[PDB]
């Protein structure tokens, strides 16, 4: 087929994928806030005797400890995963890289300048 339609397809796919990924990320953030507020529950016990206040404080200190231990273990595991992922990435590159060196061209100077230089003095309209 024509190549212009193919380029239009390519850029349209770029836009489609970008917009869908962005909307998915937005939904992830919204659900993150929603579910976390559903998990972290606000309290209100002002004016109470300091015994109950301190009981709540100790309970929430323990809860802080639990959440910190869990999340920090998860973060350590995820960091290990990311390290292993990087190792595999390097391995696959070394297996299939090498030839991966790009080439840059500055020889292709502006074509209008080329036309001007060739036509010399007669380079008036082109």
């Amino acid at each position: 087929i024509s190549a212009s339609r193919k380029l239009q397809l390519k850029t349209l796919m770029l836009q489609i994928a970008k917009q869908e990924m962005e909307r998915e990320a937005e939904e992830r953030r919204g659900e993150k806030g929603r579910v976390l507020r559903t998990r972290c529950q606000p309290l209100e016990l002002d004016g109470l005797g300091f015994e109950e206040l301190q009981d709540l404080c100790r309970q929430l200190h323990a809860r802080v400890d639990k959440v910190d231990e869990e999340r920090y273990d998860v973060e350590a595991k995820v960091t290990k995963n990311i390290t292993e992922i990087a190792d595999l990435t390097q391995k696959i590159y070394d297996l299939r890289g090498k030839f991966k060196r790009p080439t840059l061209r500055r020889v292709r100077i502006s074509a209008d300048a080329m036309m001007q230089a060739l036509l010399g003095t007669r380079a008036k309209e082109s």
Binding site: K98, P102, T103, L104, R105, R106
Partner: protein, 371 residues
């Protein structure tokens, strides 16, 4: 911004922006003051013509190269050459461009330190990095192993590399190069009657060497043939007429590479220093070095050298190993192409010697981690 990949060399300065295929401006590195008196007034006569301008007025100049053997012997002239290269051949002020010089292996430290001090104080570049001239030539071939013989015009050096790990104890640097071949050719031309003495006529002898000389596959047979027939005598027209005829001087000039006893040097030829450089390497990477022998540099452009060298090494090496000699057609600019590739890499972008680092440690920063 873009990086400036300069390459001082010795005989031809090659420069250009990083990321292209060929250097933008290539011109001899000679600075020649006029030597006669000068009677016309107001002719606009300068005090020193550098670069390619002094190859056109060479009739009344005394050209003198500022780089003898890799090392730089005349710092003022080298500064003048760099200033010309930046401002007139590229027309880019150095205040806005990183630079990537190149240096031969085993050179004096003071040369490198003075080079970085000049680049940081006079031209005031943002950041400069100095690289060994052989690793770049290995970049350009797209390999990652191999032993590269970079026979420039100043000095011939032979750096073996395996899997990206250079072997510092196996670098064999020999000071025979194109300039000594020019002098020897100028010395053997006197056997027919042609005397070239002036420093300007050295350029004519260099042109003769480039256009006519070739490396013989077998030396004795060629010496016997040239002494009986006359099928070798090729003629050449001087810059004023009076054609000359070169006989068996054709393959005797570049033969000095394989027998440095001709110019009185003791060492062994470029065919045997490569084998010695290989044999110093470990016993398990010798096959790969045998199979990936790389040629570079200008002087390895003689017609018929990639066969003579292969024959010699095959004679020296064990009979089982395969000897292959990589001789790309873009040999002359191989170092600069490799320099462009290296400067265009993203992984390399943090190895430059930033100016604040130089301000904190002085010119001796180049020997440190930022090599």
């Amino acid at each position: 911004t873009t990086a400036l990949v300069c390459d001082n060399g010795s005989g031809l300065v090659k420069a250009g922006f990083a990321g292209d295929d060929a250097p933008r401006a290539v011109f001899p590195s000679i600075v020649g003051r006029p030597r006669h008196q000068g009677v016309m007034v107001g002719m606009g006569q300068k005090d020193s013509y550098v670069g390619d301008e002094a190859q056109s007025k060479r009739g009344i100049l005394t050209l003198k190269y500022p780089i003898e053997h890799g090392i730089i012997t005349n710092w003022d002239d080298m500064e003048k050459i760099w200033h010309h290269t930046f401002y007139n051949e590229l027309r880019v002020a150095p205040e806005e461009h990183p630079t990537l010089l190149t240096e031969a292996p085993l050179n004096p430290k003071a040369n490198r330190e003075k080079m970085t001090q000049i680049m940081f104080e006079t031209f005031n570049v943002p950041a400069m990095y100095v690289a060994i001239q052989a690793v770049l030539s290995l970049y350009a071939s797209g390999r990652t192993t191999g032993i590269v013989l970079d026979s420039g015009d100043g000095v011939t050096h032979n750096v073996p590399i395996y899997e990206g790990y250079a072997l510092p104890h196996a670098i064999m640097r020999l000071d025979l190069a194109g300039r000594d071949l020019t002098d020897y050719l100028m010395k053997i031309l006197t056997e027919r009657g042609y005397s070239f003495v002036t420093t300007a006529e050295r350029e004519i002898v260099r042109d003769i060497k480039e256009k006519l000389c070739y490396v013989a596959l077998d030396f004795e047979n060629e010496m016997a043939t040239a002494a009986s027939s006359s099928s070798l005598e090729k003629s050449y027209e001087l810059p004023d007429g009076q054609v000359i005829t070169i006989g068996n001087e054709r393959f005797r000039c570049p033969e000095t590479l394989f027998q440095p006893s001709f110019i009185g040097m003791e060492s062994a030829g470029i065919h045997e220093t490569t084998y010695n450089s290989i044999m110093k390497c470990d016993i398990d990477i010798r096959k790969d070095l045998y199979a990936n022998n790389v040629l570079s540099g200008g002087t390895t452009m003689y017609p018929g050298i990639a066969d003579r060298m292969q024959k010699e090494i095959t004679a020296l090496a064990p009979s089982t190993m395969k000897i292959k000699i990589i001789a790309p057609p873009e040999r002359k600019y191989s170092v600069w192409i490799g320099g462009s590739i290296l400067a265009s890499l993203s992984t390399f972008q943090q190895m430059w010697i930033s100016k604040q680092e130089y301000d904190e440690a002085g010119p001796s920063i180049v020997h440190r981690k930022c090599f």
